[PDB]
């Protein structure tokens, strides 16, 4: 594995620092490393493919070296080199892809392909170098084991969930009380509604609460919290809980009262914010709890009073809400987010080559399904597969 | 740094009899030399010597680095290898004069 | 061109690895490269500027080299160096800017300025090095020919378009059926409305469809698809198609039925998703097709039944919608996105120096106009101009 | 300070470039630098902590160098090294944290801790090197005196502000005219409402305006401007200005007329856009001014005419709005944004160790409070503290 | 830049210490320094001007040295010298002026002109000398970044502002209550008026307050505070707030009651004085708050009682006031004051040569406009430009 | 007292006439004066503060003199100097302030502080100069 990495920063820090011009000196420490490789290789036959629509190109090795008898690289030097790199490029591609599909329950955290199982071999370790690519940096630290970690802009921690819970309902659905929400990606929107506008509620206040349990702990999260749930601020016709009929939601929005957001870790409050909208920090949590209330306005102008009668029919439905977005955070486990192409790379290679569904990943690498049942096996396979995708993107995008 | 090295250099090259080398030449020769890398071999070794340099110097039998003056009836220390002696592997708290 | 690049990583990897203290050994391979430059230079004279409100500063060179002596940098060494760099800095700026404005129809993909036309010269090539800056990495590969590629967050592929199409309308605009949308940047929101709530429609279902054709193919796209179009979920007074009057839209939202998203490439379905909300991957496409339906609720509580009468007036307008956002994707062509400052840099330099409108780019480098008619000439000029902006940002932000 | 930096890229470019195998010569230039350090250190004792729940761990030095002999590193070489790095890791952490809390009103820009005050010492500067980490790159240029500059995404320039201004109101709040808005982070949404639909207004047009003054200038901003303010497009019951009662807002949305956005700098218009929605560039500004109008529709279908009577009661409230989002921008001052973890790191370390509120930063490092009164002292302390957080994240995430 | 300085103290300490008489030895240390210069120069070529009505002049060098021979100085020695100085005089003038007009947004700090950009060159640094000129003394310390400082008599910190605020008013403007003031330069005069003489006010006392926010902190300020605002002690006919009409102010003055002056820094009270008139010290502040009251006289002789009836018309308007003048203070930023000619020099050179308005400074170098929006760029440019003016005044007044 | 004065015009006519560029000889008469000081100092220790919110920092001395590397100064010369001046600056401040608070009815026209009472000492007078302030 670590092997694999080098093979690339080798080529990038190569196809990049080797051009018509420069002084040798820039590459002395480089050229060397390079050659070392060629040697170890030459003579070993490699096989890739043998699944779905994946060609089976075979590769032989018999390549010359790189004279160090020069100062300024003459064009002629480049071309006689690029021609030798373009075999490694078109190679690695066919290598990544091959181990970017196979899955294993028992040892999923390990290598699979007849291509890689041979790389972890000892006689090859003679290469490894310059491990500063965020992902490998983290692969290693995970095998000796310690405080690993990554960076994500608008991460993808919430499996898609869009539903409601009626705490008070009746067949006609003309006087409901409950909450409706949308948890997806890095965002949560939740609204609490009370058709009666807390007319018969103690202190004329109806309490609401929304709890979201993350499948992985997020640390160092920068979060935007805003009052109101725009998504649930418009008229809707919704299916009843049993699917037998449809109800009408005609919201009128009031400010959420006594807003309290708690970021908990193992049941303990790590961060708590009372009615603080804007940017807040949640430093370590596996659960978010949003509590908010609808308080019947004690003073109402005629126009307002008219919306909230003492008796049914209740035609304007009092609604309070919150919107929470995790802009950035760190997670000890790999996740999809709004900037990295890893998930898309893995999913794309599998789709393009018609790779059959395996025993670990959900059909189509479906994110919601994956994060909903993010087992240790899925995570180890995901990390292996994401790390390979990142190695590949250093050369092929 | 000047001549010294240059002289030997040319000599070993055989071909020319130094002397009749305009003084503008020998020095100019240095000016150019003092701008190149160094056979990894050569270089790689010097780096080595420097790192240990310190260690050798104090590690010798005859010769040590400087002495301190306190004019303060001071307590002699004791170290297995020398017995009752007045060393001190640490000068800190008193000016230093190269 | 490639020339230009070096001139920078030269300075950055310079103004960065050179400070009061450090051992020579961290720069031996560096110092060298540097000097090499100085030589090639001094002796040659330069001219930059002219066009628009841009000063014309003339530059001469003849700077002494360095020292390979001290194997432990003394402050005095730095200052005598920084003073020589600050002429190259204030130089390059005036260089980038000069070729960051000239455009050319015929062969407007190569160098233009009297400054650069002289750089591509052969006697200069003796510099090129460390091409690891994502953009140059891609410039080269394009020169030779190969699968290039860049990375973008919330890419800017959709020219702004906000409109509607009335499939059924009449003068009074009291019983309309059609769609309205907003395509902008990386997002699409589309709503299908039927004032009659499919009362006389076959199977009481009204079909809708929204097709968006990208001007460039996007690959490896991570996309968020959510039901509902919040933007079209509120009451509106809109201008009629002919601009002669205004109509009233009073939406009530129902869940979109039989949602099907197709990502097509040259007319072929590459990815298709049926009613899958949340995160989905579209691996290669030039067109997005969103199909969704409004199905009249077969069972309605009184409150719902009241919104949908058997006869006009239709006062509550049944609406179904979708929201699609491209979080990240790869494109073989340069594009503006939500993170990179390239477009803003180019646009800003042109605005600051009152650069006259040219023959290639739309007035003000207007993104919508540019992407709407993204001709080969505009793309080649944009790439040249974006690559220069990226070279400049390594030193001047 | 600069000292501190090195200590890290030292370790990263270390714990990264040293793996079982690699041919020596990839590190010769590296090993050296390393050792140099060890020397300078050994013999000097250090002290950290001493506040809140911050342990007072003590440290000492006395370590063997690193055999620069071998040609290919053997496993045994690594382990005898990693064991020496893990003391520097666990060290630096305790170092960063210590100076990542202390604050000073006067010279709150310089070093404070008994740990760092000793680092700026001269005998230590024998270490500095490879200052390519975006943040240090900028620290220096600032200490030297020049145009700094940082890169962002959905930056956090607007302190949270959600309010309204009634330009025409009366006790019953049945015929209001004014604006309501939400400024937060990188986004602004503003709506102008006129209950009378400009029935008695000159030219049947009501003018609106929203001005936002940034606490710091933003340059090279890529901005999305869209018509409509979805946040203010739904029915609301709002508290009156004096808090004595509640009013009803029942919006119906019309297109904003004569939209003009001005990005001003010191009172001067730098960029102006007339009705241009989509992506626009604002190259240098400290103020944004959004002007827009509500124009009573000159021609109305019956359904529309019915919403806007000649006499009260006014039951449908004409509303026009705008949404503006700063996707990316450059600022000469550090700021929180949607991608960087700096603010979250600083805030998190302080929260975890129960660090008492100090004299500079608002309680909890509250962003809104900080940006609202972004004094020079808060900025210097923030930059110091953000730069340290970035040094720490190179090793510990 | 520092270069520039020397060029002068060179000449002054020259055209001053060199005349028909004196012994050599009192200038030996001087002569030397001088010559050194000549050398560095000779051969080098210059250019100045080329902007607006500014003459473009070219200069060359080729001069003799000095007879370090003679014991005394014979007349003949002088003349052969003065003739060589008068070329440097008439030179420097044309040099200062050239860089005393150019402005720049990005690096508004550094040099601009083709004359100076060449001076900061390294080969010229061989000239610095005697920097006891208050301004250079401060220029340097600012590069090294440290607590600078200047000395000012009647400083110019308050942008001109002359207005009023009516806290109680009515159409007839026959019973007003509010304040009127004049903030200008180093002075503030503010009056609080109550047409009713607090007849219906709690405790028959009307409270007033005037807050002035400085654009820069002033330290070590010697201030004169006196009761009464003579400027607002006479009858006036004033324009109404809306400009639609004019009101009558007919003051009668009473002693200000419970006078409290607070000099605040970042919201904190640094100095507070209760009813202390005369000379007071404000050691560090960015805000001044003046609070004072009008207390209806509890005992009134007939003549007084007659001015203050229980019912309108109120014909004599009770007024209380304060006058505050900052005699001297120190500021870390350059400012105009009542003694220094810097602002006038810069403004005068620009006016005389018809220099076009630039991107940094307000038209005409208008002080009020400048101090009102005293941006970092304006301050850096102002300091550069003020320092040059001070260098010039050492030789040319 | 007069002592005190010098300590400054020393530094000003110093932090001013000493820049990356001037020829040595333009400061020969200056360098000298300077060193002379250093000598007299090093060794003797001082206390400042000890009143209200005034910090009590202890100042000790230990400094090497000044080179001369002919033909205008090299940057390296400056820095190794500025670093030695910045201890005298931050010092004097703490010195002035200490005797700028104590008062005395009887003989309150003379030195009061444990800092200055030691300066008027004789072994120090060897400094005074350029009294044009
Ligand atoms: Zn984003």
PDB file of C-alpha atoms in Angstrom, chain A residues 29 32-33 36 122 125-132 134 137-138 140-141 144 146-151 153-154 220-222 225-228 230 233-234 251-255 271 273 276-279 281-283 297 299-304 307-308 316 325 327-330, chain D residues 12-13 15-17 19-23 25-26 28-29 72 79 82 86 153-154 156 160 171-173 182 184-185 187 189 230-231 234-239 243-248 337-341 343-345 347-348 351-352 366-369 392-397:
ATOM      1  CA  UNK A  29      17.900  14.279  -4.857  1.00  0.00           C
ATOM      2  CA  UNK A  32      18.180   9.141  -7.712  1.00  0.00           C
ATOM      3  CA  UNK A  33      14.945   8.158  -5.949  1.00  0.00           C
ATOM      4  CA  UNK A  36      16.020   3.112  -7.551  1.00  0.00           C
ATOM      5  CA  UNK A 122       8.939  -6.904   0.994  1.00  0.00           C
ATOM      6  CA  UNK A 125       9.372  -1.442   0.115  1.00  0.00           C
ATOM      7  CA  UNK A 126      12.692   0.015  -1.177  1.00  0.00           C
ATOM      8  CA  UNK A 127      10.761   2.983  -2.599  1.00  0.00           C
ATOM      9  CA  UNK A 128       8.430   4.887  -0.230  1.00  0.00           C
ATOM     10  CA  UNK A 129       9.014   8.675  -0.034  1.00  0.00           C
ATOM     11  CA  UNK A 130       7.517  12.210   0.535  1.00  0.00           C
ATOM     12  CA  UNK A 131       4.295  11.308   2.386  1.00  0.00           C
ATOM     13  CA  UNK A 132       2.760  14.772   2.767  1.00  0.00           C
ATOM     14  CA  UNK A 134      -3.099  14.686   3.510  1.00  0.00           C
ATOM     15  CA  UNK A 137      -0.404  11.183   6.156  1.00  0.00           C
ATOM     16  CA  UNK A 138      -3.550   9.801   7.740  1.00  0.00           C
ATOM     17  CA  UNK A 140      -0.039   5.659   8.229  1.00  0.00           C
ATOM     18  CA  UNK A 141      -1.019   7.175  11.596  1.00  0.00           C
ATOM     19  CA  UNK A 144       0.505   2.403  14.294  1.00  0.00           C
ATOM     20  CA  UNK A 146      -3.388   7.324  17.124  1.00  0.00           C
ATOM     21  CA  UNK A 147      -5.313  10.587  16.770  1.00  0.00           C
ATOM     22  CA  UNK A 148      -5.972  10.469  13.018  1.00  0.00           C
ATOM     23  CA  UNK A 149      -8.152  13.089  11.278  1.00  0.00           C
ATOM     24  CA  UNK A 150      -9.357  15.021   8.188  1.00  0.00           C
ATOM     25  CA  UNK A 151     -10.836  18.316   6.975  1.00  0.00           C
ATOM     26  CA  UNK A 153     -16.203  21.846   3.956  1.00  0.00           C
ATOM     27  CA  UNK A 154     -19.957  21.253   4.439  1.00  0.00           C
ATOM     28  CA  UNK A 220     -13.869  21.426  15.656  1.00  0.00           C
ATOM     29  CA  UNK A 221     -17.162  22.177  13.831  1.00  0.00           C
ATOM     30  CA  UNK A 222     -17.967  25.717  12.676  1.00  0.00           C
ATOM     31  CA  UNK A 225     -27.552  28.501  13.365  1.00  0.00           C
ATOM     32  CA  UNK A 226     -30.434  30.642  12.199  1.00  0.00           C
ATOM     33  CA  UNK A 227     -34.007  31.022  13.394  1.00  0.00           C
ATOM     34  CA  UNK A 228     -36.801  29.813  11.059  1.00  0.00           C
ATOM     35  CA  UNK A 230     -37.821  28.262   5.316  1.00  0.00           C
ATOM     36  CA  UNK A 233     -42.758  27.944   5.975  1.00  0.00           C
ATOM     37  CA  UNK A 234     -45.068  27.391   3.049  1.00  0.00           C
ATOM     38  CA  UNK A 251     -48.005  27.906   8.329  1.00  0.00           C
ATOM     39  CA  UNK A 252     -47.629  31.389   9.748  1.00  0.00           C
ATOM     40  CA  UNK A 253     -44.201  31.900  11.314  1.00  0.00           C
ATOM     41  CA  UNK A 254     -43.339  33.251  14.772  1.00  0.00           C
ATOM     42  CA  UNK A 255     -39.883  33.589  16.310  1.00  0.00           C
ATOM     43  CA  UNK A 271     -21.478  22.801  24.127  1.00  0.00           C
ATOM     44  CA  UNK A 273     -26.033  27.802  23.217  1.00  0.00           C
ATOM     45  CA  UNK A 276     -27.484  32.416  19.855  1.00  0.00           C
ATOM     46  CA  UNK A 277     -27.921  32.785  16.094  1.00  0.00           C
ATOM     47  CA  UNK A 278     -25.044  33.253  13.679  1.00  0.00           C
ATOM     48  CA  UNK A 279     -21.739  31.398  13.950  1.00  0.00           C
ATOM     49  CA  UNK A 281     -18.428  26.394  17.568  1.00  0.00           C
ATOM     50  CA  UNK A 282     -19.205  22.780  18.603  1.00  0.00           C
ATOM     51  CA  UNK A 283     -15.830  21.282  19.531  1.00  0.00           C
ATOM     52  CA  UNK A 297     -48.222  36.183  21.482  1.00  0.00           C
ATOM     53  CA  UNK A 299     -50.394  41.003  22.742  1.00  0.00           C
ATOM     54  CA  UNK A 300     -51.870  40.929  19.271  1.00  0.00           C
ATOM     55  CA  UNK A 301     -52.921  43.604  16.806  1.00  0.00           C
ATOM     56  CA  UNK A 302     -56.360  42.884  15.206  1.00  0.00           C
ATOM     57  CA  UNK A 303     -54.791  41.346  12.081  1.00  0.00           C
ATOM     58  CA  UNK A 304     -52.825  38.928  14.264  1.00  0.00           C
ATOM     59  CA  UNK A 307     -55.420  34.382  12.795  1.00  0.00           C
ATOM     60  CA  UNK A 308     -55.711  32.792  16.234  1.00  0.00           C
ATOM     61  CA  UNK A 316     -53.482  29.648  10.217  1.00  0.00           C
ATOM     62  CA  UNK A 325     -25.543  24.092   8.979  1.00  0.00           C
ATOM     63  CA  UNK A 327     -19.820  24.606   7.469  1.00  0.00           C
ATOM     64  CA  UNK A 328     -16.657  22.707   8.375  1.00  0.00           C
ATOM     65  CA  UNK A 329     -15.544  20.048  10.823  1.00  0.00           C
ATOM     66  CA  UNK A 330     -12.941  17.404  11.453  1.00  0.00           C
TER      67      UNK A 330
ATOM     68  CA  UNK D  12       5.622  17.055   9.155  1.00  0.00           C
ATOM     69  CA  UNK D  13       8.115  17.089   6.302  1.00  0.00           C
ATOM     70  CA  UNK D  15       7.071  12.186  10.104  1.00  0.00           C
ATOM     71  CA  UNK D  16       6.194  12.123   6.405  1.00  0.00           C
ATOM     72  CA  UNK D  17       9.446  11.767   4.431  1.00  0.00           C
ATOM     73  CA  UNK D  19       9.455   5.574   5.975  1.00  0.00           C
ATOM     74  CA  UNK D  20      10.941   2.079   6.094  1.00  0.00           C
ATOM     75  CA  UNK D  21      12.929   2.067   2.831  1.00  0.00           C
ATOM     76  CA  UNK D  22      13.388   5.410   1.065  1.00  0.00           C
ATOM     77  CA  UNK D  23      16.810   5.996  -0.408  1.00  0.00           C
ATOM     78  CA  UNK D  25      19.344  11.200  -0.633  1.00  0.00           C
ATOM     79  CA  UNK D  26      15.692  12.289  -0.537  1.00  0.00           C
ATOM     80  CA  UNK D  28      20.105  14.553   3.047  1.00  0.00           C
ATOM     81  CA  UNK D  29      19.029  18.202   2.786  1.00  0.00           C
ATOM     82  CA  UNK D  72      18.619   2.871   2.569  1.00  0.00           C
ATOM     83  CA  UNK D  79      11.506   3.480  15.455  1.00  0.00           C
ATOM     84  CA  UNK D  82       9.711   8.149  15.948  1.00  0.00           C
ATOM     85  CA  UNK D  86       6.769  11.813  19.834  1.00  0.00           C
ATOM     86  CA  UNK D 153     -14.890  30.770   0.781  1.00  0.00           C
ATOM     87  CA  UNK D 154     -18.289  31.927   2.098  1.00  0.00           C
ATOM     88  CA  UNK D 156     -17.694  35.499   7.685  1.00  0.00           C
ATOM     89  CA  UNK D 160     -25.508  38.373  12.695  1.00  0.00           C
ATOM     90  CA  UNK D 171     -50.743  51.266  15.939  1.00  0.00           C
ATOM     91  CA  UNK D 172     -52.876  48.656  14.143  1.00  0.00           C
ATOM     92  CA  UNK D 173     -49.905  47.742  11.871  1.00  0.00           C
ATOM     93  CA  UNK D 182     -30.841  39.102   7.695  1.00  0.00           C
ATOM     94  CA  UNK D 184     -25.069  36.839   8.551  1.00  0.00           C
ATOM     95  CA  UNK D 185     -21.724  35.423   7.530  1.00  0.00           C
ATOM     96  CA  UNK D 187     -24.963  36.497   3.072  1.00  0.00           C
ATOM     97  CA  UNK D 189     -31.244  38.908   2.302  1.00  0.00           C
ATOM     98  CA  UNK D 230     -37.074  33.696   0.243  1.00  0.00           C
ATOM     99  CA  UNK D 231     -36.536  34.202   3.951  1.00  0.00           C
ATOM    100  CA  UNK D 234     -43.763  33.776   3.939  1.00  0.00           C
ATOM    101  CA  UNK D 235     -46.449  34.842   6.503  1.00  0.00           C
ATOM    102  CA  UNK D 236     -45.113  36.047   9.783  1.00  0.00           C
ATOM    103  CA  UNK D 237     -46.262  37.376  13.101  1.00  0.00           C
ATOM    104  CA  UNK D 238     -43.599  39.778  14.284  1.00  0.00           C
ATOM    105  CA  UNK D 239     -42.960  41.773  17.448  1.00  0.00           C
ATOM    106  CA  UNK D 243     -42.035  45.053  21.922  1.00  0.00           C
ATOM    107  CA  UNK D 244     -45.534  45.974  23.106  1.00  0.00           C
ATOM    108  CA  UNK D 245     -47.494  43.950  20.502  1.00  0.00           C
ATOM    109  CA  UNK D 246     -47.284  41.809  17.347  1.00  0.00           C
ATOM    110  CA  UNK D 247     -48.037  42.595  13.686  1.00  0.00           C
ATOM    111  CA  UNK D 248     -48.970  40.385  10.752  1.00  0.00           C
ATOM    112  CA  UNK D 337     -14.981  31.581   6.800  1.00  0.00           C
ATOM    113  CA  UNK D 338     -16.825  28.358   5.811  1.00  0.00           C
ATOM    114  CA  UNK D 339     -13.735  26.222   5.229  1.00  0.00           C
ATOM    115  CA  UNK D 340     -10.912  27.079   7.624  1.00  0.00           C
ATOM    116  CA  UNK D 341     -10.833  25.530  11.086  1.00  0.00           C
ATOM    117  CA  UNK D 343     -11.585  29.957  14.719  1.00  0.00           C
ATOM    118  CA  UNK D 344     -12.938  26.537  15.712  1.00  0.00           C
ATOM    119  CA  UNK D 345      -9.458  25.341  16.817  1.00  0.00           C
ATOM    120  CA  UNK D 347     -12.331  28.339  20.411  1.00  0.00           C
ATOM    121  CA  UNK D 348     -12.146  24.581  21.007  1.00  0.00           C
ATOM    122  CA  UNK D 351     -13.341  25.598  25.845  1.00  0.00           C
ATOM    123  CA  UNK D 352     -11.742  22.204  26.503  1.00  0.00           C
ATOM    124  CA  UNK D 366     -18.195  34.762  19.948  1.00  0.00           C
ATOM    125  CA  UNK D 367     -17.833  35.593  16.272  1.00  0.00           C
ATOM    126  CA  UNK D 368     -20.621  38.108  16.011  1.00  0.00           C
ATOM    127  CA  UNK D 369     -19.278  40.050  19.011  1.00  0.00           C
ATOM    128  CA  UNK D 392      -0.613  23.138  15.149  1.00  0.00           C
ATOM    129  CA  UNK D 393      -2.889  21.668  12.427  1.00  0.00           C
ATOM    130  CA  UNK D 394       0.179  20.641  10.405  1.00  0.00           C
ATOM    131  CA  UNK D 395       0.747  17.929  12.995  1.00  0.00           C
ATOM    132  CA  UNK D 396      -2.341  17.598  15.157  1.00  0.00           C
ATOM    133  CA  UNK D 397      -5.850  17.618  13.760  1.00  0.00           C
TER     134      UNK D 397
END
